[PDB]
Structure 1
Amino acid sequence: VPSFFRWLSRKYPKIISPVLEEQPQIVDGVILPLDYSASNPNGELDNLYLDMNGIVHPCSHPENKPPPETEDEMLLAVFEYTNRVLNMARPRKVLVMAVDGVAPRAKMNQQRARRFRSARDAQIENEAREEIMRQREEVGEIIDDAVRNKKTWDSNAITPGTPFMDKLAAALRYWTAFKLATDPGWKNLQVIISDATVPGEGEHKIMNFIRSQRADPEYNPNTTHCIYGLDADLIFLGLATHEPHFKILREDVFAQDNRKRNNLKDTINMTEEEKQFLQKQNSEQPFLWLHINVLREYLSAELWVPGLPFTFDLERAIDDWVFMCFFCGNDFLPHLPCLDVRENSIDILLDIWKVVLPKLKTYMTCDGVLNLPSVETLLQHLGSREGDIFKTRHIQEARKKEVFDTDEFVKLFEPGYHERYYTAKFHVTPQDIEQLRKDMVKCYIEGVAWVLMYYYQGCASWNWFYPYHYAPLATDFHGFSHLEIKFEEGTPFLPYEQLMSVLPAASGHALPKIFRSLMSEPDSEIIDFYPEEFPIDMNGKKMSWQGIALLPFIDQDRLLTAVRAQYPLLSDAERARNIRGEPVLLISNKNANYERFSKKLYSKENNNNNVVVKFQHFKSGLSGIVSKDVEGFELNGKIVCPIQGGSLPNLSTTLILKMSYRLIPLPSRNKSIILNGFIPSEPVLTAYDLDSIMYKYNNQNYSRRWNFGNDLKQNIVPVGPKGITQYKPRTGGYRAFFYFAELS
């Protein structure tokens, strides 16, 4: 269990809810196929969004049993995992499948380092295994070369643009077509596929899709949404969507912290009994719910401030909270030295905001736009307060105490660390200290603005990068009250450009012959950007893999020249994958809009591949723009199964309709306003919980063990609309008078 999960469970305990996973009955050896049209015990669900990376990644190269066969085993595992998730959630309106693709230049800074660290770990473990076999062979035993050559799955090879992504995308389409054809309950379900060709990080695609579904006047505000992902920030990102009917599904990491991890050798000691018990135990994986509707009430009861010149708005209150949480920690910028734990600093930042809010005469952020003087005052107050936090952290570290090593020599607890911290990154020169401080201030402000725009109003630069490795220390951004931030739109990177900007190590061989020849040659124009020994590992507090790299950045112009030089001699078949592509929408044979789609597109009109159809959410759902498919799909045809050894029956094209889906362009800026006609959920909170969250509780102090206990006693929480009227009865009369009479 992560520290963030523990923090959110301690501060907000009721957000943890139990799940109801159906177990199909087994009679006479056979397995009863579970129904899909039956009512879901976990409440009605309409929209489900799934990050396909979060399923294809754990299935491949797992920590218990690596797939012994070829990619086929991983494909079967991800197919059964997706089937289990679909049966658990049971979407009724639209099911969304998205996998990571092209990402903006800011993401390469940390993704490249993570991939290189993983590759180095794989290389060193392979060397250790080779040494183990060499020592074992000295005794006299003989091991087949197949076992020795049976290396890992090369997790670094899973990158957008590789043929593995294309093979996975081809398999996914067949799987969803088979599911739509063979399941009568999928008649109204609509499935979209966002392959690795489509740019996005997996979650930003979901944000764009939900803002495009909210880009229609007739969109129902009462629709429920579910997003499944293992990322910790996923539960936090869904709050920014301003959708009360939201809940996050994820695996129960509380049990998985100390789950079954015994060695395979012990599985044969007791023969049938122990193996049967083990296979029964791991067959069921508990999950949990991360409802956001309840969390909105907790945030409302925790962000209240008495006395304010402006008007307290719940929608605007969450904006400052999400901006501050992103500032404290995100996967786009280096961690602030002051905010390292990222858990205990949240309350300090919140009370700083509470004490500075009366001084300010305006809100923190306005629809993603950061108020420059207000944020300047906030960071000035934090820097004034950061001294006490730094002193307490140093005292705690000293009490606890009682690969380059850089932070140890800094000795931040001693007075005068302002230049001592910067000496670990640059030379000992006075004016250079000020120059680097100003540059870091400008870069950090630009990065904060860029991440706010990306997570609120979508991508705005697509090429911005962070040209630094160490975040500025406390009392930063002293004078910056004159800069104006205005980002420029840039074209997304090509799949090959993004793949080489990820910069896999020499172990990776997903590149074609030309690119690997241009790399492996000792006299390479970009050989300086590709280390071999990788000695850039550096601790900087923390431990284990949490250390960051210090390798030099990559110049975009050199990589562009390299790709433009390698392009002309590449084969046309391989170059055919350079197309950005568009998401593909799949609908059932008996869909409400199926007749209209079959009469408009792929019909007797026989237009020259330029007719598009725009439809609203009044009929069926999934508002958007559909276009002619660019693949080989055609009416009265057949689709070849790519799984091969999967015993999957072939299907015809008359059962599944395939077309290219394009999101509706945003007319105006995506504001944060609750849509009219939204029906609030049932009132579940009590004033006691409001007081509990208003008073500062030191993790409940373990006075009565209220943190952990009858967790299952919280039961399920009702979801969906509750009551025709969207306004709670306050004073008034008639209906409110009758309610008061029946209550009192």
Structure 2
Amino acid sequence: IPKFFHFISERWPQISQLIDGSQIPEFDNLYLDMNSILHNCTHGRLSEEEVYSKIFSYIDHLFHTIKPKQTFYMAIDGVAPRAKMNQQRARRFRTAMDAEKALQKAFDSNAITPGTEFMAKLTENLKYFIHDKITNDTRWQNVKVIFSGHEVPGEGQHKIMDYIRAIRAQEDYNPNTRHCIYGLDADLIILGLSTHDHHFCLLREEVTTLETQNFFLLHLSILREYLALEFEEITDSVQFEYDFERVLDDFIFVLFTIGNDFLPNLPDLHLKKGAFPVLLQTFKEALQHMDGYINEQGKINLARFSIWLKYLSDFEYLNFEKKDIDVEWFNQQLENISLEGERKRTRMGKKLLMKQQKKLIGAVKPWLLKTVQRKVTSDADFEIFPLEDKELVRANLDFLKEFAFDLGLILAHSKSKDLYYFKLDLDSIXXXXXXXXXXXXXXXXXXXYSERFVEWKDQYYKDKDTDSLKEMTENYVGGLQWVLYYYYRGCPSWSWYYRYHYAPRISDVIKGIDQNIEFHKGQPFKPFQQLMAVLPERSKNLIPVVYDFYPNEVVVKISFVDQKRLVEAMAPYDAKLSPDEKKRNSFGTDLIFIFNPQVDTVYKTPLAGLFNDIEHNHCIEREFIPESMENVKFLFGLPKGAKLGASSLAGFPSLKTLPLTAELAYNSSVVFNFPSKQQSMVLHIQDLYSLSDLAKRHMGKIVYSRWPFLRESKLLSLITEETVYEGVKSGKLTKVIERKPQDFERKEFRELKMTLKSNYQRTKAILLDDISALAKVVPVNGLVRNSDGSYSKSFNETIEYYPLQLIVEDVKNKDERYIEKEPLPINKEFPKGSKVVFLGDYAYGGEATVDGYNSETRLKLTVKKGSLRAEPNIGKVRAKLDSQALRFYPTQXXXXXXXXXXXXXXXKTVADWLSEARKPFVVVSLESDSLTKASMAAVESEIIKYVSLPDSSEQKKLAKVPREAILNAESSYVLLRSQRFHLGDRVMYIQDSGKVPLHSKGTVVGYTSIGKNVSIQVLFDNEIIAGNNFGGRLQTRRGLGLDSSFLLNLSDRQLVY
């Protein structure tokens, strides 16, 4: 939907988290919607090796970003239902056209469709990659890999949704399953929301090389929390039982109604002009003038939906009777609508009051006139008129008492106030037949579109007064219903479709709700028939060359295929296919891939270039995947005992952890590039209330920072305007020192507080109290081994500051990856047969196998020395060349700067001359440099020849080895990160998983620190299926940026002996 991510992002400004090598949450399941990848990898013709090189690299990249623990689910598009074939066929036709039109004059992308010759190979290739991976990447070895390829009918998106819905439907489903779906389509956010699984993210890529691309976790846990805040404002006004999950479901129907992939958009919604606030507002008001929800688990209530429609119709109508439409106009429309809802609900309430008022006189009259029929003499000699709605009595006491006064009555009660009633005011008194007339007079007293419009609408339908409109209309309304069912329950029909290119006017949808809608499940086309129902006589050559409905000229007003006419026109030519085409023109199954050490088979490669066979180390089988449905219902909404808010698993965000107040406002929030011109959910944070015992309680202990995304950190000091509380390790117990601030600390503190409060307002719509203190913290960056074999919390060296009000003391669910652990015995910490990294001079970085133990402190191993030849030399050589070739000086700045300041002065010149000079950009963080492009290539050439000199390996039985000559690279990310790296330094990939085969050497060509996280740029010895040429700088795929935790540095050996 057109501004949907943009609009959602600005309005609810904390929903998404940049992935930047800091810890992200653990996930149970990752689902890949892959079709965007295949496209994106087959443009920028390049070769099959290079093409699949990319795709493997992409799938692999996303798999390592998440590290799913249970299920990894890959999906490609099978044959779609008819509801999509017109657009499938419009898209496809535009590609063939644009190819011929553009490029050709001034690879056939359409091959990526099911049944195609390309796609039969793709499945052969991908399968190979999966097998290679499950054989060699340890991380890929404890998950279910499930491939649902193009052989199987349905959209990836939809196939994924059917899996999630099938597993959540069970009676043993983990209630707090952490879900992640990768994909570019904003719609996934809505499908995600549709599942009602709180612990759910979307892997996405930016929207303003692979290792330097930005990816985000969009967090549905906090989005839901924001949504709850969006709609809570009612709770008290709706005429049914308020339920957020049901509200959310209706908000989803509204979102599908606004846009979805199948029906065409309703005309003039004006999204890219700020109707969005208004459309929502529409829903908000509608929800209050209805008898229950619009959406019964995907079933639509048309009666209900037309109450919402009426608002949408007024919307259409008012905006026709406007000139241009802009934000200014929608902002004032938003106000008017709110004001109307307020007025309307006030009248509604006056009406209710008046009704109660009438029943009341209506019940009093006969008992009053009988009471006043008896003249007084000389209290219990009368009937009392009890009143029963105490709560409503109590809200109406001035009235009741004035009523009582007027009719000559008292409003009485009881000491315990459990009974109210009227009674004659007897203590207040003859032709007093004037009391009976005064009573009677008192009782009497209380008993008191446009036409230019229709035409302008008619001139729309003509362009692209009847009852074939009832037919259009009803097709559209049917559609909405097909869409919702599709998403909440599964494809309801392989054959339903919207038979028109355009949507009706909003104010007309009404004509089409007077229907009873059912569907017939049907069955999907065979591949080749779909192949024909889509594809133009311009990419005819992907269809088995053997075969109107196919223009050369064509909002794409491409004709709709007559299906009946088509299955038949092909069945002549049906029996003439190969055995491979009868293979391609059928359906497959989902496949499942398992790891099994006792499997040892040879897997042939369907690829050239850098790929080979998977040898005596091949370890996967494929199988058909079932699913096991039964007499099982789907589960709609949250599962029983699902943890939400402050009880969410670690890693996932929550607003519920602090105490706060939320309000929609024009906060000019700056989520992207310019300040939003619409309201944000502004968060007003409440201070928690000593400041001395606070310091004493938490100093040097673990407190939670980053609010929104609470991670553990250690509290270092507690700045204040006039006082610093510091932490000093006294050995065992760290204690608190209080002192006045130094001038720069008092400077920093004032400059910091002002900077935080406005950044939180401008960037996140968090309105802070005003900064009391300031917790200074460092975050937990892993675990780390101590001498005694124990493992304990490690911390990032970089100081961060947070207002104290955003500091949380504790959290129910703690990040398991950071539970400190006690020492272990040799045989458990390095079990017999375990594979390990040998430190120590014989083979620094050698593959080691634990054979047994000599002692209970010494162990014996087999160490493979992977090479008997000296490490190559150039990196080092070149590093010193560059540094000698480009000397730096202190102000009292590089020789190339000297030449630029001597060029500018000698020309006296400007200005553009300077902008011209600025073209070759050397723009990067402070500790991070590079080898000269020259050097880079010299390193490449001198490697290419090194890696073809004769060379051999060598093993050695070793014994009496002390535990610290060996390490588990697996669980030493911190140690490894702690290593210097310099340009030229020889390096080895040391990790049992990732994108480089174990033990590969390379040279460091340049480092790049994104603050705290270092990324080493490695020119590898051998080519790497996952690498690149560092954007031309190289001539082969030897290049890769990588995190230091993957690398042993062999030049500057920092862990030897």
TM-score using structure 1 length: 0.70
Compute the RMSD of aligned alpha carbons: 3.3
Relative to structure 1, the CA distance from residue 581 to residue 328 in structure 2 (aligned partners, 3 Å threshold; closer, same or farther) is same
Match of 1:300 in 2: 228
Match of 2:968 in 1: none
Match of 1:685 in 2: 655
Match of 1:573 in 2: 580
Which structure features the higher share of strand residues?
Answer: 2
1:655-711, Cα deviation, whole Å (9 max, x unpaired): 112210123336354242321232225373169997545456676866978555899
The one of 16, 37, 47 equivalent to 1:55 is 37
Per the TM alignment, residue 357 of structure 1 is displaced from its structure 2 partner at its CA by: 2.3
The one of 78, 82, 91 equivalent to 2:55 is 78
Relative to structure 1, the CA distance from residue 511 to residue 474 in structure 2 (aligned partners, 3 Å threshold; closer, same or farther) is same
Q: Does 1:377 align with 2:307?
A: yes
Q: Does 1:328 align with 2:258?
A: yes
Relative to structure 1, the CA distance from residue 214 to residue 340 in structure 2 (aligned partners, 3 Å threshold; closer, same or farther) is same
Q: Does 1:583 align with 2:537?
A: no
Paired residues for 1:272-351 under 5 Å: 284-304=212-232, 305=234, 306-341=236-271, 344-351=274-281
Unaligned runs of 5+ in 2: 330-450, 648-653, 678-757, 767-799, 815-1057
Relative to structure 1, the CA distance from residue 580 to residue 213 in structure 2 (aligned partners, 3 Å threshold; closer, same or farther) is same
The one of 332, 354, 368 equivalent to 2:284 is 354
Q: Does 1:457 align with 2:477?
A: no
Q: Quick one: distance in 2 between partners of 1:690 and 1:569?
A: 72
Per the TM alignment, residue 386 of structure 1 is displaced from its structure 2 partner at its CA by: 2.1
The one of 438, 452, 467 equivalent to 2:499 is 467
Q: Does 1:210 align with 2:164?
A: yes
**Which SS does the other structure have where 2:306 is aligned?**
helix
Answer whether contact 1:639 1:653 (CA < 8 A) is retained. Answer: no
Q: Quick one: distance in 2 between partners of 1:242 and 1:479?
A: 33
Match of 1:424 in 2: 463
Q: Does 1:43 align with 2:25?
A: yes
Q: Quick one: distance in 1 between partners of 2:801 and 2:50?
A: 39
Answer whether contact 1:115 1:156 (CA < 8 A) is retained. Answer: yes
Q: Quick one: distance in 1 between partners of 2:486 and 2:287?
A: 26
Highest CA radius of gyration, 1 or 2? Answer: 2
Answer whether contact 1:447 1:466 (CA < 8 A) is retained. Answer: yes
Match of 2:69 in 1: 92
Q: Does 1:253 align with 2:253?
A: no
Q: Does 1:108 align with 2:85?
A: yes
Answer whether contact 1:457 1:669 (CA < 8 A) is retained. Answer: no
Q: Does 1:231 align with 2:185?
A: yes
Answer whether contact 2:667 2:762 (CA < 8 A) is retained. Answer: no
Count of residue correspondences = 563
The one of 600, 605, 622 equivalent to 1:641 is 605
Q: Quick one: distance in 2 between partners of 1:298 and 1:362?
A: 23
Relative to structure 1, the CA distance from residue 702 to residue 206 in structure 2 (aligned partners, 3 Å threshold; closer, same or farther) is closer
Relative to structure 1, the CA distance from residue 82 to residue 495 in structure 2 (aligned partners, 3 Å threshold; closer, same or farther) is same
Q: Which amino acid aligns with 2:194?
A: A
Paired residues for 1:702-721 under 5 Å: 706=761, 708=763
1:317-376, Cα deviation, whole Å (9 max, x unpaired): 111111111110111011111324267333223222222223211111111000120012
The one of 133, 138, 148 equivalent to 1:184 is 138
Match of 2:565 in 1: 558
Answer whether contact 2:591 2:625 (CA < 8 A) is retained. Answer: yes
Relative to structure 1, the CA distance from residue 331 to residue 293 in structure 2 (aligned partners, 3 Å threshold; closer, same or farther) is same
Answer whether contact 2:13 2:763 (CA < 8 A) is retained. Answer: no
Q: Does 1:549 align with 2:568?
A: no
Q: Quick one: distance in 2 between partners of 1:713 and 1:364?
A: 47
Q: Quick one: distance in 1 between partners of 2:558 and 2:28?
A: 46
Match of 2:628 in 1: 664
Q: Quick one: distance in 2 between partners of 1:210 and 1:390?
A: 43
Q: Quick one: distance in 2 between partners of 1:552 and 1:194?
A: 31
**Which SS does the other structure have where 2:646 is aligned?**
coil
Relative to structure 1, the CA distance from residue 709 to residue 697 in structure 2 (aligned partners, 3 Å threshold; closer, same or farther) is closer
Paired residues for 1:714-733 under 5 Å: 722-723=812-813
Per the TM alignment, residue 232 of structure 1 is displaced from its structure 2 partner at its CA by: 1.9
1:522-578, Cα deviation, whole Å (9 max, x unpaired): xxxxx2x1101x1x3xxxxxxxxxxx1112211011111123222111112211222
Per the TM alignment, residue 125 of structure 1 is displaced from its structure 2 partner at its CA by: 1.0
Q: Which has the higher contact order (CA 8 A, sep 6+)?
A: 1
Relative to structure 1, the CA distance from residue 481 to residue 231 in structure 2 (aligned partners, 3 Å threshold; closer, same or farther) is closer
Answer whether contact 1:496 1:563 (CA < 8 A) is retained. Answer: no
Q: Which amino acid aligns with 1:94?
A: T
1:292-319, Cα deviation, whole Å (9 max, x unpaired): 0000111111122131221111211111
Answer whether contact 1:514 1:566 (CA < 8 A) is retained. Answer: yes
Q: Quick one: distance in 2 between partners of 1:386 and 1:687?
A: 42
Match of 2:883 in 1: none
Per the TM alignment, residue 651 of structure 1 is displaced from its structure 2 partner at its CA by: 3.6
Q: Decide which moves more: 106-115 or 456-465.
A: 106-115
Q: Which amino acid aligns with 1:297?
A: E
Relative to structure 1, the CA distance from residue 192 to residue 343 in structure 2 (aligned partners, 3 Å threshold; closer, same or farther) is farther
Q: Decide which moves more: 68-77 or 327-336.
A: 68-77
**Which SS does the other structure have where 2:467 is aligned?**
helix
Q: Quick one: distance in 2 between partners of 1:665 and 1:393?
A: 57
Q: Which amino acid aligns with 2:567?
A: L
Q: Quick one: distance in 2 between partners of 1:2 and 1:642?
A: 41
Q: Quick one: distance in 2 between partners of 1:697 and 1:424?
A: 43
Paired residues for 1:112-191 under 5 Å: 112-129=89-106, 153-191=107-145
Per the TM alignment, residue 17 of structure 1 is displaced from its structure 2 partner at its CA by: 0.9
Q: Quick one: distance in 2 between partners of 1:466 and 1:572?
A: 36
Q: Quick one: distance in 2 between partners of 1:342 and 1:320?
A: 23
1:356-400, Cα deviation, whole Å (9 max, x unpaired): 22321111111100012001222123213321233346455999x
TM-score using structure 2 length: 0.50
Match of 2:919 in 1: none
1:199-224, Cα deviation, whole Å (9 max, x unpaired): 11110000001111113211101111
Match of 2:524 in 1: 492
Q: Quick one: distance in 2 between partners of 1:472 and 1:588?
A: 54
Q: Quick one: distance in 1 between partners of 2:256 and 2:595?
A: 40
**Which SS does the other structure have where 2:625 is aligned?**
strand
Q: Does 1:368 align with 2:388?
A: no
Answer whether contact 1:679 1:722 (CA < 8 A) is retained. Answer: no
Q: Quick one: distance in 2 between partners of 1:690 and 1:416?
A: 52
1:581-640, Cα deviation, whole Å (9 max, x unpaired): 1100011116xxx9xxxxxxxxxxxxxxxxxxxxxxxxxxxxxxxxxxxxxxxx865321
Identical counterparts, % of pairs: 38
1:81-105, Cα deviation, whole Å (9 max, x unpaired): 1111111111111111111111100
Match of 2:46 in 1: 69
Per the TM alignment, residue 473 of structure 1 is displaced from its structure 2 partner at its CA by: 1.0
Answer whether contact 2:78 2:156 (CA < 8 A) is retained. Answer: yes
Unaligned runs of 5+ in 1: 23-40, 63-67, 130-152, 255-280, 400-411, 426-432, 516-526, 537-547, 595-634, 725-744
1:121-144, Cα deviation, whole Å (9 max, x unpaired): 111113434xxxxxxxxxxxxxxx
**Which SS does the other structure have where 1:451 is aligned?**
helix
